[PDB]
């Protein structure tokens, strides 16, 4: 096969942006929160029925 | 004596009820499970105004929940105080209205009325003496304006000597909630005007206008707008249940509000209203209530009152207060705006006093008045309707259930006639 | 998101029927929702309320909307998985030798992170005294110890909290009382203990042993009865907010120092039918009648009995004016002025007259039981 | 008490219909092997999920779907995967010979031996349900095999049942991308069958979908797998209200009477947003105002067309999330005042506001990331004329010298059928122009 | 409730943009990663609901090298993931190239990006745009950007901190052309433009900072402070607030002349700064010193029409007016005849921040001046002559015509440059 390997798969990512079908641009930031959880959004303050 | 029943149709009518009954319930201190827990004997004196009795000592509200779809009905039950309703009186359909007015008045709704017309009959005769009917429904929805209006028309023929009230939330022009808003509203008034003893317009647009400029809140919810109305609805019927200087039943409000046979539409405004942080700085004096209660921004309708003249004015002062101060404030305001009050009806303000104030405050006022300002709300609806009909847009659904083009034309004729006649007296002089 | 379900049952009053629900709990945003087992219809539409994370444990109760409902057992397997390790149950008691310090010892328990769930005080009996220690019968000191157990009042309480049993044990210190002070002076035993057999308190060691001692002293059918003396006495009830604010030890400790002989006290969880009627007398005064009777229903509440010479007058002279907001200005040393914060939560409550008090104290401990 | 019967016909429709069941199954809380999760066996006391599942009396919840395809390869793939244990064994009816993109073959020659079983399957599913609301049918107009079967079912269903609502999630031919070499033919004839039988037709052209994925999701090599989910996510948006508590619910019987101005016009193009990859998502608050503004942006239109080229008749968009009703009122007010987007003259108001309390749930490991606020739109604007005109023009060239018409003549398909079909598309095209002219 | 958007274009503009962000980031209390280690800061940033913040900026350019440095350094987390629009090819100082051949296909994404940001904000005050005329790409793209900006929005104010070429020190060889075409476009679109030529800057650091080897890293730093000095009033409590909108009505005498020259003081190294008191009298004295003009012009060579100077530091107001009296009395600084009072005093409280590893030393007081000067005609005078000489024999002309531009466009620039010179002479004549 003489196939490329994940050890070389990432390198090709950095060189010419050559990927495999259906995979995403990984920038490897520093997530203080877990990407899978946490709804990645902003919440505007909303209390109970204030007219009470 | 002089008791009333409660009937609601469509989710707009039903949703409103969820607050009124919870709004009204607190006043007498009835706990959710029907066990009395109030302080004063006055709290129990007129439990006959809206309630009844049953074995076991637990009370129950007399309501009629009528609609064609299960989404709205299955929800209100689970809410707080939702266990008070008798499951026997529940009635519901299985198909759904789909917002087609013709669908909810002749094709589907007409079939299910017999069951609903049955429930209404027992309560009316089952009481000591029936005073009238109060109903909450939406003029902007297919199931409401179609099936809702059917209930009133049949009822009126049966009980010629009773009065009725309808608190309809007419759809404002800027924000529309149903692409069929024009048709289902224009047709609705046709039947309503003939037999509806009374009808007062409340604008959802006003609901949003009042909150963001007076209460000083950040994000209202559907309950927020709902809460006020349920408090408001008690205002007209507040003085029928508690002792006071000048008691005034629902009819008495009728006598001094409708000068002529057809002009029978009203608008309301609630005060006082102070914000969370502004709840203490404002000083409470009887003159304080008057300014806002006639204040333009306090009117609960989109129509601007300053663009017309008041045919008649009514006011229900709430709580204990010096009798004269109630009047002296009223007359002065009557002269200080002599131009805005039509000149051919002297002494065009009524007053009332109820000694038991709503819990949480010390003095409050509910505004009701028939004014030439309500002219605009029809014209805005009139302009929209004429646009669509010329191109027969959105018409196939309505005509496919037996309706014929002429009936639509006839409804408009009455609609415009009411608007034209209303401005007839605006320029009238003595 | 993440859900825990506790099937619940409510004891209505219209008829003998009883019903069960699910009483779901959204830990994501503290929302409440309930569902009924009969007719399979939605009951509570997932609204907001006031339920605290520590008030949800097997064998506890919490009110919602003037309805008394309590947990029964685990609903789904998912729930019994998370709470299997946390939320044990271990019982505690205080020997009569520490009677004149009872309020203080209670003080540190709350601060530690546990919860005071149940509490009772009674006078042990010789016949059951031997039954109290079923395993130590043969030991040489077993007889002598039993002889001492029948001296004077005993204060009982159940400790519930995350890993409570071990946390309780490390709070006492070493077995012998003498050795504790040399090594552990920050424990109950390092401050109050006197001799080897007069250990400040005795606790539960093993979960297998922890179960029995809890039933024996808090079962529906127990041999120990209240010892409330109904002559020359006045009654007072600690309002719930003190338990929620974690100062109950302070309130109790305050009245012990005055020399009062504290006679009887047993917890009481109560609902509307037994709340309004007790305060029903004030119908014509205290225009806050509904609230004070209302708030009395929410959360645990202690019941107290006090007697020195003149039950009401002598105690009322330190009970002070009913309005706490004005108590501070004219009564700094009185009880409430240190805790009262507003009109409807004014801490300790005192009856009105000496001649009327007796029946009040008889209500809790004679009929309500 | 509301149920809906799901029908899938045609390979491309099969895969798309495949994904949606993963999105729907994940949303409610049902495990892959049919039996509820052991952890929360009876946790879900409320019967909210009835909208798509029917109790077996004792056990799992059987999907309310019927999968059809005249070629065993793709379906046999379905009946060997991890979901093999979910669908009813004897409802996935498979044939013997493929239609080979021969529409005449898929409607007059082979289909007559399998239509009956499909109808029988349709009937038995309904009897269990009590309140049938309507029919959702997926099918790919680009394939002959789907087209012939797809046309037949609607006509058969329209007569067997009657007035029940009918909807179709088709995928028409891309303006410039193509898959087969005879797509112009099979598309035009198919439109004839679906024109006079369906109340609503949706636009999901695949050419735009590829464009949509690249610009936001940041994926340079998209395959059919990514395309399928988006539609599956789109489906949940319209059907979210029927199965969750809602401050303002909208019924499928309520959708029909607010989107079709006239008896003939029953098409519209949809769009969805926001769709932000988890890598670059949390940098924006995702306000109610900005999401709506991007909603009408030409780029995010799921269908390859330019709405600026025409007018708007009526758009019904349902939100989902924690939107504040005033904020919803906040968004619309701005849109109308805008000048770049203009409505048709005879419709002063064209918004149907919808809100919900159930936000989307993210399929694990996918491109999409979780977000509180989401909105789906489907508008019927005069822009759709471009696709119909573009398809029609392509038809004229081939028919100039009867190229490729000999095979369709080989399956009992009358020659004049093309003559009659051509007129209807031309008739439809003239319909759009007449409606848009000002009064 | 007031916000301002930042627009940057060109390598110098991009690099000059980077410099201002380090000062702003370290000024308000945000680490480079974007998180906050536990309402004024809204003036430049926004909140995404949880955690970090997203600066309100947009970067445009045609060459990826400079920008690609950003997305690989320590400031990678901050800027918007997609707002750093990047092209594929370089214009290569062919001013035409950046306006009719390559700029047309990329400006579109720019207009959309600005469209989004304006929606989120509520109090759009104005646009501050940096662009260098000394380079082709930075010129052509900038010109179209400003042209589309005005027509799309309307009356919203704009600011441009351009960078023209030095009198004698030069960077490119075609600077005379791209410089001329820049002024014509910016003349009718940018309300306020500050000259910041380099040749003064090198004289600024060496004369004071005693840095004999200044590098572009340090040069960008000075403009970073000045942006801090001018914007400081918008994001801190003050006894006298002067808003960005309150500049066009205190610095522009006529609709045409809308150019001012910048200058800064004091600048002193921490090794030598702490042996003098730094009194207000001298600090204002050093402000008008001909040495210190941030731009290469001679103040002694012309009139003054208006000079708005913003103190910032702990200066007590009382010293303010007295200093003004000192300036007005010296006979060596003569104001224009028709303007009696030529000052608009502004004061702030927050002391200037010092970035670690910098050259400037923390001072308790400072002055930043932005005033129109009649001398500014010197650069136009010198530049106009240069264009005439090289255009005599159509040097380099055969290329610019190679990107679609017409020959007639160049000629009209010459006439316009003549008009600007004529007006300046007219304004100087006493009545
Ligand atoms: N949305 C979507 N469309 C697809 C996909 N694959 C194929 N198509 C479309 O489907 C058309 C062909 O019909 P398919 O449904 O794919 O296959 P089929 O149903 O078996 O029809 P035949 O190929 O004629 O047998 C092609 O022109 C494509 O445009 C897919 O994965 N997703
Ligand atoms: N003050 C200052 N100016 C710079 C710096 N770097 C570049 N410049 C200016 O940029 C001009 C040359 O153009 P470039 O820096 O190459 O960028 P450009 O103007 O957009 O033209 P391009 O080369 O096409 O990118 C010079 O005349 C300088 O005035 C810097 O670090 N500091
Ligand atoms: N203020 C307020 N109005 C409501 C609420 N729910 C519904 N409405 C009104 O009801 C109208 C639409 O009702 P509709 O959906 O047709 O009711 P249905 O026909 O019974 O389904 C809208 O114009 C709303 O203004 C609510 O919670 N609050
Ligand atoms: Mg196929
Ligand atoms: Mg370059």
Short mmCIF file of C-alpha atoms in Angstrom, two decimals, chain E residues 41-330:
data_model
loop_
_atom_site.label_atom_id
_atom_site.label_comp_id
_atom_site.label_asym_id
_atom_site.label_seq_id
_atom_site.Cartn_x
_atom_site.Cartn_y
_atom_site.Cartn_z
CA UNK E 41 -14.75 48.66 28.13
CA UNK E 42 -17.83 48.38 25.88
CA UNK E 43 -16.54 51.30 23.82
CA UNK E 44 -14.26 48.94 21.88
CA UNK E 45 -15.38 45.37 22.71
CA UNK E 46 -18.47 43.18 22.98
CA UNK E 47 -19.63 40.37 25.25
CA UNK E 48 -20.54 36.97 23.83
CA UNK E 49 -22.45 35.90 26.94
CA UNK E 50 -19.89 33.66 28.64
CA UNK E 51 -16.14 33.99 29.00
CA UNK E 52 -14.08 35.91 26.46
CA UNK E 53 -14.75 38.92 24.22
CA UNK E 54 -14.52 39.57 20.48
CA UNK E 55 -12.80 42.81 19.38
CA UNK E 56 -14.77 44.85 16.86
CA UNK E 57 -12.36 44.89 13.93
CA UNK E 58 -12.10 43.85 10.30
CA UNK E 59 -8.88 43.19 8.37
CA UNK E 60 -8.58 43.39 4.58
CA UNK E 61 -5.54 42.79 2.38
CA UNK E 62 -4.46 40.96 -0.75
CA UNK E 63 -1.24 39.34 0.50
CA UNK E 64 -1.53 36.54 3.08
CA UNK E 65 1.97 36.76 4.59
CA UNK E 66 1.31 39.62 7.02
CA UNK E 67 -2.10 38.38 8.15
CA UNK E 68 -0.96 34.75 8.29
CA UNK E 69 1.51 35.94 10.90
CA UNK E 70 -1.44 36.89 13.12
CA UNK E 71 -3.23 33.54 12.90
CA UNK E 72 -0.04 31.77 13.95
CA UNK E 73 1.20 33.95 16.83
CA UNK E 74 0.08 34.60 20.39
CA UNK E 75 -2.92 36.74 19.31
CA UNK E 76 -4.60 33.87 17.44
CA UNK E 77 -7.55 33.39 19.79
CA UNK E 78 -8.79 36.98 19.82
CA UNK E 79 -9.80 38.21 16.38
CA UNK E 80 -12.95 36.89 14.75
CA UNK E 81 -12.42 33.46 13.14
CA UNK E 82 -13.59 34.55 9.69
CA UNK E 83 -13.33 38.35 9.75
CA UNK E 84 -9.67 38.20 8.67
CA UNK E 85 -10.61 38.15 5.00
CA UNK E 86 -7.59 37.00 3.00
CA UNK E 87 -7.07 36.97 -0.75
CA UNK E 88 -4.72 35.04 -2.99
CA UNK E 89 -2.50 37.44 -4.97
CA UNK E 90 -0.57 40.65 -4.34
CA UNK E 91 -1.35 43.91 -6.11
CA UNK E 92 2.34 44.94 -6.10
CA UNK E 93 2.04 48.71 -5.77
CA UNK E 94 0.09 49.01 -9.02
CA UNK E 95 -2.45 51.46 -7.58
CA UNK E 96 -4.67 50.72 -10.56
CA UNK E 97 -4.51 47.00 -9.81
CA UNK E 98 -6.19 47.53 -6.46
CA UNK E 99 -9.15 49.46 -7.85
CA UNK E 100 -10.38 47.97 -11.16
CA UNK E 101 -8.79 44.53 -11.73
CA UNK E 102 -8.44 42.70 -8.41
CA UNK E 103 -10.20 44.88 -5.82
CA UNK E 104 -13.64 44.52 -7.39
CA UNK E 105 -13.97 40.80 -6.62
CA UNK E 106 -13.04 41.07 -2.92
CA UNK E 107 -14.54 44.35 -1.66
CA UNK E 108 -17.93 42.62 -1.65
CA UNK E 109 -17.12 40.43 1.35
CA UNK E 110 -15.89 43.59 3.06
CA UNK E 111 -19.17 45.49 2.70
CA UNK E 112 -21.09 42.49 4.06
CA UNK E 113 -18.76 42.19 7.05
CA UNK E 114 -19.32 45.83 8.01
CA UNK E 115 -23.03 45.28 7.41
CA UNK E 116 -23.20 42.61 10.11
CA UNK E 117 -21.36 44.55 12.81
CA UNK E 118 -23.49 47.68 12.43
CA UNK E 119 -26.57 45.59 13.24
CA UNK E 120 -25.32 44.21 16.56
CA UNK E 121 -24.29 47.61 17.92
CA UNK E 122 -26.75 50.33 18.87
CA UNK E 123 -24.69 53.50 19.15
CA UNK E 124 -22.59 53.60 15.97
CA UNK E 125 -20.54 56.75 16.44
CA UNK E 126 -18.08 56.69 13.55
CA UNK E 127 -15.43 54.82 11.63
CA UNK E 128 -11.69 55.07 12.25
CA UNK E 129 -9.88 53.74 9.18
CA UNK E 130 -6.12 53.31 8.74
CA UNK E 131 -4.55 52.97 5.30
CA UNK E 132 -1.13 53.65 3.81
CA UNK E 133 -0.87 55.51 0.51
CA UNK E 134 2.77 54.54 0.11
CA UNK E 135 1.66 51.16 -1.18
CA UNK E 136 -0.50 50.18 -4.11
CA UNK E 137 -2.73 47.55 -2.55
CA UNK E 138 -3.31 49.57 0.61
CA UNK E 139 -4.28 52.45 -1.66
CA UNK E 140 -6.68 50.96 -4.21
CA UNK E 141 -8.58 48.81 -1.73
CA UNK E 142 -8.80 51.69 0.73
CA UNK E 143 -10.13 54.12 -1.86
CA UNK E 144 -13.04 51.91 -2.87
CA UNK E 145 -13.71 51.02 0.77
CA UNK E 146 -14.24 54.66 1.71
CA UNK E 147 -16.23 55.32 -1.47
CA UNK E 148 -18.68 52.52 -0.72
CA UNK E 149 -18.73 53.36 2.99
CA UNK E 150 -20.17 56.86 2.56
CA UNK E 151 -22.89 56.09 0.00
CA UNK E 152 -24.06 52.96 1.83
CA UNK E 153 -24.48 54.63 5.23
CA UNK E 154 -24.76 58.40 4.87
CA UNK E 155 -24.01 60.97 7.56
CA UNK E 156 -21.97 58.77 9.92
CA UNK E 157 -18.58 60.36 10.52
CA UNK E 158 -15.29 58.82 9.39
CA UNK E 159 -11.63 59.13 10.44
CA UNK E 160 -8.49 58.17 8.55
CA UNK E 161 -4.96 57.93 9.96
CA UNK E 162 -3.09 57.77 6.68
CA UNK E 163 0.69 57.51 6.30
CA UNK E 164 2.19 59.52 3.43
CA UNK E 165 5.79 59.22 2.22
CA UNK E 166 8.65 61.11 3.81
CA UNK E 167 10.16 64.28 2.32
CA UNK E 168 13.52 62.72 1.45
CA UNK E 169 13.51 59.19 2.92
CA UNK E 170 11.57 56.97 0.51
CA UNK E 171 10.30 53.40 0.59
CA UNK E 172 9.08 52.66 -2.94
CA UNK E 173 9.93 54.19 -6.32
CA UNK E 174 6.37 54.79 -7.56
CA UNK E 175 5.22 56.63 -4.43
CA UNK E 176 4.63 59.90 -6.35
CA UNK E 177 1.81 58.32 -8.39
CA UNK E 178 -0.08 56.30 -5.80
CA UNK E 179 0.18 59.24 -3.40
CA UNK E 180 -1.50 61.64 -5.82
CA UNK E 181 -4.45 59.38 -6.67
CA UNK E 182 -5.04 58.74 -2.97
CA UNK E 183 -5.67 62.35 -1.99
CA UNK E 184 -8.26 62.89 -4.74
CA UNK E 185 -10.50 60.08 -3.50
CA UNK E 186 -9.98 60.73 0.21
CA UNK E 187 -10.50 64.45 -0.36
CA UNK E 188 -14.29 64.18 -0.67
CA UNK E 189 -14.98 61.22 1.62
CA UNK E 190 -12.87 61.33 4.80
CA UNK E 191 -13.94 64.05 7.23
CA UNK E 192 -10.73 64.03 9.27
CA UNK E 193 -7.26 62.92 8.17
CA UNK E 194 -4.11 63.18 10.28
CA UNK E 195 -0.71 63.34 8.61
CA UNK E 196 1.76 61.04 10.36
CA UNK E 197 4.75 60.91 8.00
CA UNK E 198 7.64 58.78 9.22
CA UNK E 199 10.61 61.12 8.96
CA UNK E 200 9.40 62.99 12.05
CA UNK E 201 8.97 59.74 13.99
CA UNK E 202 12.59 58.65 13.70
CA UNK E 203 13.44 62.14 14.92
CA UNK E 204 10.99 61.56 17.77
CA UNK E 205 12.43 58.40 19.33
CA UNK E 206 16.11 59.12 18.75
CA UNK E 207 15.97 62.69 20.02
CA UNK E 208 14.23 61.70 23.27
CA UNK E 209 14.18 57.92 23.70
CA UNK E 210 17.93 57.67 22.97
CA UNK E 211 17.25 54.61 20.80
CA UNK E 212 19.84 54.64 18.02
CA UNK E 213 18.35 51.52 16.38
CA UNK E 214 14.58 52.05 16.26
CA UNK E 215 12.64 49.36 14.42
CA UNK E 216 9.18 49.14 12.90
CA UNK E 217 8.10 47.34 16.06
CA UNK E 218 8.68 50.57 18.00
CA UNK E 219 7.31 52.93 15.35
CA UNK E 220 3.88 51.30 15.41
CA UNK E 221 3.90 51.72 19.20
CA UNK E 222 3.74 55.52 19.10
CA UNK E 223 0.54 55.57 17.04
CA UNK E 224 -0.81 52.99 19.48
CA UNK E 225 -0.67 55.52 22.31
CA UNK E 226 -2.08 58.39 20.25
CA UNK E 227 -5.13 56.28 19.48
CA UNK E 228 -5.28 55.68 23.23
CA UNK E 229 -4.90 59.41 23.90
CA UNK E 230 -7.66 60.45 21.49
CA UNK E 231 -10.17 57.72 22.36
CA UNK E 232 -9.55 57.91 26.11
CA UNK E 233 -12.41 60.36 26.69
CA UNK E 234 -14.97 57.80 25.51
CA UNK E 235 -14.12 55.06 28.03
CA UNK E 236 -13.33 56.75 31.36
CA UNK E 237 -14.96 59.14 33.79
CA UNK E 238 -14.13 62.76 33.10
CA UNK E 239 -14.93 66.30 34.17
CA UNK E 240 -15.01 67.35 30.50
CA UNK E 241 -16.02 64.96 27.72
CA UNK E 242 -15.31 65.56 24.03
CA UNK E 243 -16.86 62.93 21.77
CA UNK E 244 -15.69 61.79 18.35
CA UNK E 245 -18.72 63.48 16.80
CA UNK E 246 -17.46 66.68 18.45
CA UNK E 247 -14.44 67.12 16.16
CA UNK E 248 -15.77 68.20 12.77
CA UNK E 249 -17.20 71.30 14.50
CA UNK E 250 -13.95 72.34 16.19
CA UNK E 251 -11.19 71.63 13.65
CA UNK E 252 -12.46 72.29 10.09
CA UNK E 253 -12.61 75.90 8.89
CA UNK E 254 -14.12 75.21 5.46
CA UNK E 255 -15.72 72.21 3.74
CA UNK E 256 -12.58 71.67 1.66
CA UNK E 257 -9.63 71.93 4.05
CA UNK E 258 -9.96 68.91 6.34
CA UNK E 259 -6.35 67.95 7.14
CA UNK E 260 -4.50 68.29 10.44
CA UNK E 261 -0.98 67.38 11.57
CA UNK E 262 -0.29 65.37 14.72
CA UNK E 263 2.32 65.74 17.46
CA UNK E 264 2.96 64.11 20.82
CA UNK E 265 4.63 64.95 24.12
CA UNK E 266 6.17 64.17 26.43
CA UNK E 267 8.28 61.19 25.34
CA UNK E 268 11.14 60.23 27.66
CA UNK E 269 12.87 56.99 28.65
CA UNK E 270 12.52 55.69 32.19
CA UNK E 271 16.31 55.81 32.60
CA UNK E 272 16.34 59.59 32.08
CA UNK E 273 12.71 60.58 32.73
CA UNK E 274 12.78 60.70 36.53
CA UNK E 275 15.03 63.73 37.02
CA UNK E 276 12.55 66.52 36.21
CA UNK E 277 9.19 67.64 37.54
CA UNK E 278 7.28 67.65 34.23
CA UNK E 279 5.25 70.77 35.01
CA UNK E 280 2.18 71.69 32.96
CA UNK E 281 3.78 74.95 31.84
CA UNK E 282 6.68 73.17 30.13
CA UNK E 283 4.62 70.23 28.87
CA UNK E 284 2.37 72.61 26.96
CA UNK E 285 5.57 74.45 26.05
CA UNK E 286 7.02 71.28 24.54
CA UNK E 287 3.77 70.65 22.67
CA UNK E 288 4.38 73.43 20.14
CA UNK E 289 8.13 72.90 19.84
CA UNK E 290 9.04 72.59 16.14
CA UNK E 291 11.14 69.54 16.96
CA UNK E 292 8.28 67.34 18.08
CA UNK E 293 5.75 67.46 15.22
CA UNK E 294 4.65 63.89 14.67
CA UNK E 295 4.49 64.88 10.98
CA UNK E 296 7.28 66.55 8.99
CA UNK E 297 6.15 70.16 8.73
CA UNK E 298 7.50 73.46 10.01
CA UNK E 299 4.96 75.26 12.24
CA UNK E 300 6.90 78.49 11.98
CA UNK E 301 6.15 78.56 8.25
CA UNK E 302 2.42 79.26 8.44
CA UNK E 303 -0.65 80.33 10.35
CA UNK E 304 -2.69 78.46 12.94
CA UNK E 305 -6.46 78.06 12.58
CA UNK E 306 -7.38 75.66 15.37
CA UNK E 307 -5.61 73.36 17.83
CA UNK E 308 -7.65 71.06 20.08
CA UNK E 309 -5.42 69.55 22.75
CA UNK E 310 -6.56 66.74 25.05
CA UNK E 311 -4.84 66.56 28.40
CA UNK E 312 -4.86 63.20 30.10
CA UNK E 313 -3.47 62.31 33.49
CA UNK E 314 -3.98 63.95 36.89
CA UNK E 315 -3.66 67.54 35.67
CA UNK E 316 -5.85 69.89 37.68
CA UNK E 317 -8.08 72.07 35.47
CA UNK E 318 -6.77 75.34 36.89
CA UNK E 319 -3.39 74.93 35.21
CA UNK E 320 -5.17 74.51 31.88
CA UNK E 321 -6.30 78.05 31.09
CA UNK E 322 -3.17 79.66 32.53
CA UNK E 323 -1.06 77.60 30.13
CA UNK E 324 -3.20 78.80 27.22
CA UNK E 325 -2.45 82.38 28.26
CA UNK E 326 1.25 81.53 28.08
CA UNK E 327 0.98 80.32 24.48
CA UNK E 328 -1.07 83.30 23.29
CA UNK E 329 1.49 85.79 24.58
CA UNK E 330 4.58 84.53 22.75
#
